[PDB]
Design a protein around this ligand. Sequence first.
Ligand SMILES: Nc1ncnc2c1ncn2[C@@H]1O[C@H](COP(=O)(O)O)[C@@H](O)[C@H]1O
Ligand SMILES: [Mg+2]
Length: 460
Amino acid sequence: LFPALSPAPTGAPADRPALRFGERSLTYAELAAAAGATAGRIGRVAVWATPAMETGVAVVAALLAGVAAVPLNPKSGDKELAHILSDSAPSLVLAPPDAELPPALGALERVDVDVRARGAVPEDGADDGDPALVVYTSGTTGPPKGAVIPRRALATTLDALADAWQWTGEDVLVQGLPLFHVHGLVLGILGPLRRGGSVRHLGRFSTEGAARELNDGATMLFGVPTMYHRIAETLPADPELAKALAGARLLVSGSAALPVHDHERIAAATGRRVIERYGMTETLMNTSVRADGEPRAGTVGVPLPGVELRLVPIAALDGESVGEIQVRGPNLFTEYLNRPDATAAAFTEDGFFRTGDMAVRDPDGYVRIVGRKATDLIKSGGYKIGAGEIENALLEHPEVREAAVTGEPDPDLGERIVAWIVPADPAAPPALGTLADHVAARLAPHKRPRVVRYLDAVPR
Ligand SMILES: Nc1ncnc2c1ncn2[C@@H]1O[C@H](COP(=O)(O)O)[C@@H](O)[C@H]1O
Ligand SMILES: [Mg+2]
């Protein structure tokens, strides 16, 4: 899976940078030795997945040990953590030494990840179908489901992207994405390591941080559309950001659609374009605009190498006929953990995954996503948010009689979460802050409502 790390590297390749988080870093040899030390302490593991160097060591340790890692959002609330811990039943939690873990984890064995540790790299005995990660992802109803992603899916999606993006071990990625979803963790940490390149993770994203790295040796930027929107807003004021983007080898957006207004403001300011790729937790990456292809705003390009894609079958490349994307290939997840019926429902009889995403293809083969089959989802900041579980959390509040949750358009977030509340007392309805704080404390801050509306009645 990472031949630059296992077996332990030597000579020149060993002293190449691997991970950089501000002034902290690990070379390939250092990462292999720190992850090896950690791997020997863990013969399912949770990872307290802060946007910090320890998280890269932890996840690499789990992969070197052949043990599935379950990334935890360090801002998850008590309900969300309890569910993941009960469902995935990890043996221990890998954490940074200084982290303060919440009481939901009080009974789990804690293994501190020491980035200065030096141990052997374990023999690789893993098989291609073995679980690599369990990544919790929201559905439209109920608590999040654990997508079990096999080792083969990581290797294939990363090598497919390498071909599409002309990504090599000479590339230096900058990113500031969360490390408990596949965008930040699989593409943004495991990808550079599989290529033999490096990643500079910003900790918290900022336009200034991205510009600094791109002007100082970083060659690629990955972000969600919100980050590109903030880039587009800042460009007129920020000559160094414009030069940074103009000089980059590749700018990539994913997790949600990049609006054409943001695309064109970047192109107007910098003279170059942002590649979009389309993927999901359950499928990893399906399509992309290629580095050697035509840049076309509002498209997600062509199927990656090894991905079988169909629209439902719609045969014409007419830019009009709307159909459901379905995909098959070695990029696919294994199952939803503990959910064999939901797993079966997600697949056609002939083994294609039903994305729910609606698209056309143009005469060049390029896919344009244009909606959804039956049921809209909520994407806020490029996080997929499930309405049902926010409703269920709101219903616990004593000032809420009934709740419905929707998304509405937001130029920065894409969509923002709306809470529609039948109050306990219509003359004293609960304010937004009380409801937002409650959802943030139960689930996670990124899931909080940003708007509250009061009604007499909501759907049942
Ligand atoms: N570049 C993109 N354009 C439009 N939608 C996207 C893109 N990348 C991902 N998505 C959406 O994100 C979903 C996967 O996000 P997730 O559920 O977080 O794993 C897909 O089903 C799409 O709806
Ligand atoms: Mg609903």
